[PDB]
Amino acid sequence: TYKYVNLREPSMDMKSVTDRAAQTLLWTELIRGLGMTLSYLFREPATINYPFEKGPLSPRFRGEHALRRYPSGEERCIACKLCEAVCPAQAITIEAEPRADGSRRTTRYDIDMTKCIYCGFCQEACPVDAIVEGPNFEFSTETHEELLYNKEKLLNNGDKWEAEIAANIQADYLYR
Amino acid sequence: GVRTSPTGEKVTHTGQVYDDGDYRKVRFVGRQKEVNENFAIDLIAEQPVSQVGSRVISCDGGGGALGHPRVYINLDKETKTGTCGYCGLQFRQQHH
Amino acid sequence: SNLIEVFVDGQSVMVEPGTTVLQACEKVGMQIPRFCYHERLSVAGNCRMCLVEIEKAPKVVAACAMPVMKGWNILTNSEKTKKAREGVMEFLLANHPLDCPICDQGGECDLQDQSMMFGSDRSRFLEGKRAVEDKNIGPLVKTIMTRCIQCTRCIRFASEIAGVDDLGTTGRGNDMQVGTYIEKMFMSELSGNIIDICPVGALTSKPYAFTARPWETRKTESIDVMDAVGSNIVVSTRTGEVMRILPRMHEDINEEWISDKTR
Amino acid sequence: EDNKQFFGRHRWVIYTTEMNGKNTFWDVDGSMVPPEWHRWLHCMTDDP
Amino acid sequence: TRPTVRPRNDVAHKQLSAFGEYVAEILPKYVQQVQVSCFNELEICIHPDGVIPVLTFLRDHSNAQFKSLADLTAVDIPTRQNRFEIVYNLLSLRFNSRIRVKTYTDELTPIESSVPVYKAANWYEREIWDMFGVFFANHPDLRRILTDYGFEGHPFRKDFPLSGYVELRYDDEVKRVVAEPVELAQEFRKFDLNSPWEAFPAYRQPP
Amino acid sequence: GLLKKTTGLVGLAVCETPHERLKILYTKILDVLGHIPKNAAYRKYTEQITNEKLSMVKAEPDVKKLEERLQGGQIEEVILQAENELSLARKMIQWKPWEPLVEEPPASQWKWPI
Amino acid sequence: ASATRFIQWLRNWASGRDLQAKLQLRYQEISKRTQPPPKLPVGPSHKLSNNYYCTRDGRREAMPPSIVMSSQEKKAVSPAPPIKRWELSQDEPYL
Amino acid sequence: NLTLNFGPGVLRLVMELSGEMVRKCDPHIGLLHRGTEKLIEYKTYLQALPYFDRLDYVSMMCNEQAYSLAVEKLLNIRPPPRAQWIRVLFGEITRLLNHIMAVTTHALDIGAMTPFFWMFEEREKMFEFYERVSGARMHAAYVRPGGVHQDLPLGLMDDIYEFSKNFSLRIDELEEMLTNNRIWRNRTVDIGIVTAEDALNYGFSGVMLRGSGIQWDLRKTQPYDVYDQVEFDVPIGSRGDCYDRYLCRVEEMRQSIRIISQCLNKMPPGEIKVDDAKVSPPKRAEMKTSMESLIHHFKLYTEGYQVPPGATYTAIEAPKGEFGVYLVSDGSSRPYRCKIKAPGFAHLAGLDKMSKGHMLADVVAIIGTQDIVFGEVDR
Amino acid sequence: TRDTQLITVDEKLDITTITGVPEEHIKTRKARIFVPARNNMQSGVNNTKKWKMEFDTRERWENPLMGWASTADPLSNLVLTFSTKEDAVAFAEKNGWSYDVEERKVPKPKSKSYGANFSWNKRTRVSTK
Amino acid sequence: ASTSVKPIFSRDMNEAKRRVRELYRAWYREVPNTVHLFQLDISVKQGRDKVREMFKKNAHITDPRVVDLLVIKGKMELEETIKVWKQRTHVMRFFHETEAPRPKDFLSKFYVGHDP
């Protein structure tokens, strides 16, 4: 099924020809366009008062990265390198070795936040919910070096955003 | 835990610290070295061993689907404690 | 002259007497699934992953061990063959631990890759799994024996190639365990080769533990210089570092084994 | 909060005039909102 | 029917097979192979001399009316003598069908430009020359389209390194952007992902 | 009946005598196909479909009812396709695409996967 | 929604429409940002019997292309029947 | 004549002007060529998915859909019915996102700035639908071979209904500013006229074909997903100029609301990705309890699923025209070749023809009416 | 049968000048044409079917900032696949590269007999199953 | 049979050499315009030396098809320069004014690193 957008024959009776002459001479349809912008002047603007107000987000938002812990304080990551294999941008670099107690843990865990495309595949791939993308989106830096995160930065983000990262995972894990 | 080498520089939980004559220490002049003060190797050692009454126990890290894959830990050996390969919680059998 | 004609999916192939169904399929480029069969160890026929249908035969035969008879038509892709593999793979994964992320074999596991290609895509095992005690057989081979699939490759290698009858099966039924029974170190000059033949993460390399995943290593084919045998090796590197040394096949020099010093 | 305001303006934060030793009377910043309130202020939840 | 398997359209598979023979009979001088895939796509493989005849026939014939060139691209297969493979995707609006026409060339053999048949092939052939180095004879205006001016090589060839041979940089001594040999602070890590177990026996090749 | 005011397609003018133009073009096509060898598949097929369309032009004087038979869109689109068919027939004589295959491809030219 | 009645009339007149019925600013008529937990269903393959993968393996049913003509009287045909002519919409034929 | 260098997506026009008239227009592209098609050869099929969000970065989920349809075709698997309805739902929301950008930035370029701000307050509300399903405002990567990543969050369909209940009024406000405006008409009427036969021979698609009366739309001639279970009308132009194409896009926005009203009422229950763990990853609650599910999660995210060898050309009716990928598989986990057919690549190549006998200021109108984004032209 | 004029060129195909490769990476590189060895950790043989062409490994050093693995070799990740050995040598010769070719190593056939495990008078008898 | 190959423009080296000289004349006449138009700091002598060096690199070719491609690419390169599609940076990429001289002898290469 199709419809025509601009297939019309204007009427040629003197009533209609004089209407179009009035529009041409009296600028009637241009003034009608001024009435549409006059109405907006008297509406409430959609602007929010950032930074005192913030735009709404959801529990699924993908922001700054963070490495999480178990409730005991043990790191969740067991250096399986699934996030490093799936990362479409190759932004994750991992080195691991047995820990002093024999556990499988990382010695290097860097995310180049300038290669990362903030896609979330790393948290989908992770089998222990170690690497997540948190809700923070306000971490712009003054240098390129501050955006090459290492394991210490990522563990500091996790200890900094656990209160809010845990709540978001609680509100979305049933959809995963 | 967090310790400082004989130059004032903190040592990370991986054991990393610049030698006394490493030029790479200049990056911390006027700035700081980021170290996490919550060493996980120490914290996991503070967890008491769980006393269970069966040969085989299962661990999912707590939280069901929010934990880690469910593994089963054998407890026959009475000289050591069965440790979880994912989360580090230790388990022992009830005196038999 | 003395060759006999058999068929693989209808294609004719000429094979010598005593050739197995598994070896007949190789000649046409078909590799039957396997866990317990190794071409350099004796035949065992216990994993049952090589079951294949023979046309007109009600009962599936073990390809690794069944000699091929004249005129047989081997159906390597029939529904009966495909159901046989899914059934065996289902049993093989029933008691297996969910250790793939923490298992050093992940990414190069013959149990993972034959589950993706020949097994089913989901589980219907609602019971509790079986866990077993870990043996300590030395400073080279790390044993996490909950992952063992009772294939007996290590038993046959330690006995027939290394000439050390220190590994065996203790127990019976679902409690059958592979090990030394007593606390004994498996220290032979060829001991490290049980890491390779073991298809699962039960036997892994202790020096290499947790250091890399197979997909990220670059493979450089080189020659061992630790002795005068000139064994062919593969040097696994990653980001400019040497991660491990694996044997490289050479029928005339070292086959697929290397000594512990080389490894 | 003021639930008669249109969505997006119904929650706001009046920042503190001092935080961690920094004078924030004029120099407020969006990163001064702690995580517990960061979830409520961005409407990721209805529970303060 | 299985909920997870793509359903088969046998009616359209028979129509496309019949038209493939139709084209194979009307133009025997060029057609080398005709085939229809399990998802109902028809490929006509031709000798490169038959580009203008075959394409004009498909555009103008009354039972073809393939009046739209959906796409024109190339594939590099280094193991063939004629590594490059020129693929023409055509759309018929009269018969609501699509046909694919494939030919071949190498580094030094040119392929007759199809701008006379489909005017859309102008830029599509500038991109094949720019990215693969195939030369098209009698092209009205052939030159690089996507790559940088003075760029050396053909990036989409299989033997061209992913990161190239030169990288740009601003140098304050000469007060201009310069080009220097490529150095990477982190090398592109190479992953060997292929499994050593065969996946699709239906496509197995004879030994 | 009543001549259409427009064809809907831009640049495709209305033809006031569709039947006359079609018989001229189909007859021209059949004349040109006479120069192609009889064994040629292009001649046998092109004549078969050309006659069917010509046999339908000399069976229905109603333009609106002729379109429903030809199933080629508006009658101005049929004429344009007839012109394209004629232009191809003249071009096929020069090409002669009924001769044997010029050259078979290399051994593995069309083998995929490699 | 806080506009006085005079301003509502002025904006409604200038735009020639009743804007108060369709506001571009969202109010309480939006979903609550905290929702009850879901319980999502499972697909047709979640069964404990009659569910062998070889009977629902889509990838293994794909075949290599069929060669209808390889170099190594009969009625003419087209790629498919000619496309059926479209009909005008009875909802709104002309805009 | 006079040769000028206009430009600083980012484009470079090398125009030859005889006073006020354009004699030849010579677009220079590649200012945003990034080697997407070569990079995809080093990625798995899942890793290549985010690359399609970034080709036409105004119609993100339609690019994802075309790639998924191509991979699903080579896999020989079928997404479940609910996933298809979701894809059509967000395919039509994505059409609104693109048409707002196309119409309003087109108007902004020719001096009409106000409608851009009105309709970008509706895009900001449609970006909230993207963010609530995927977590990213623009590059969702939500549509994947096999279906969609996650199911809709509870309450999202009520908010889609509230939005669509008011969007018709917003289009009327747009039309009150442009459709009958004599200044807007003088900038678009009889500008860039393309004949039907030239449109086909130059490889045009979408409103470029339909603005000139050609009755073609892949959603109706070659339907995909569940587009054959929705009722909508295809707008058709008569003059073939910029003004007729402008009306086609504005009417298509109204028909998207018509389709969206049906995807909300006809949404079925069920799963949202193919129940085949060898293609789509298992649920996280079963990857942590079943051995088979853990092996398949491990392999799908490290190696990826192998696609049977073959080559397909799959196309969809993207908002900008026919968008398609010629995807070649060698039987491994990584595509051997992925040519991306961007509709704006053929349209831009026709700028030289469409600009014959027009003023320099009509080139801006012509480029706007082709709806060109140089992420997909350059790739 | 081709109605197009052809010519005769008796010289070996050499495209080194029309490929854009810097001369450093044509003359000083050593291509290696080989069939990859089976990964010894697995029994599958599907990665030992096609010929490969890799180049000589060069220096990888440590990035001073992060410790990453830097490289100045543009060909470090280049791997080409060929159906036959001749196709591989043909491609290296016309690009001017110097190559070493290693012949395929197929595992020789073996005599497997399950009955030998229970021999009456031979050492093939196995002490366990 | 085997050596029968379709040509591009030339049928033998004599025809190909004609195109090479024509291209050389076109480049030689153009260098003064490029130096003035792009405000390059090189001299016309340096520019014409660079053209000669580029031509002499490909003086060992004896395949007419390879020569035709070299001329076809050269003509495109000249077009980008005459029409000022190139910028001052692209023209100055033939001179490598910022790359430090790489060592040529064995001892110099032995000290710096491992590359031969």
Ligand SMILES: CCCCCCCCCCCCCCCCCC(=O)OC[C@H](COP(=O)([O-])OCC[N+](C)(C)C)OC(=O)CCCCCCCCCCCCCCCCC
């Ligand atoms: C018995 C007594 C007899 C006395 C004489 C009677 C006189 C009768 C009336 C005379 C005719 C009326 C003339 C009106 C002016 C003509 C305008 C015109 O030419 O239109 C055609 C022109 C051209 O129209 P066109 O583009 O359609 O082209 C017409 C001609 N063709 C089609 C052939 C090309 O239109 C315009 O003027 C464009 C207007 C652009 C301005 C946009 C801003 C408008 C915003 C409104 C501002 C309101 C201003 C108020 C200022 C107040 C200040 C205090």
Ligand code: SF4
């Ligand atoms: S979000 Fe995507 S690109 Fe970023 S680190 Fe995770 S997987 Fe890599």
Ligand code: SF4
């Ligand atoms: S973050 Fe998760 S996926 Fe990545 S290595 Fe650690 S456990 Fe594995």
Ligand code: SF4
């Ligand atoms: S042996 Fe294989 S299947 Fe078992 S846990 Fe290790 S990688 Fe996974």
Ligand code: SF4
């Ligand atoms: S340890 Fe390994 S090789 Fe030995 S029986 Fe178990 S699975 Fe087989």
Ligand code: FES
């Ligand atoms: S391989 Fe035959 S039973 Fe194990």
Ligand SMILES: [K+]
């Ligand atoms: K092992």
Ligand SMILES: [Zn+2]
């Ligand atoms: Zn645990």
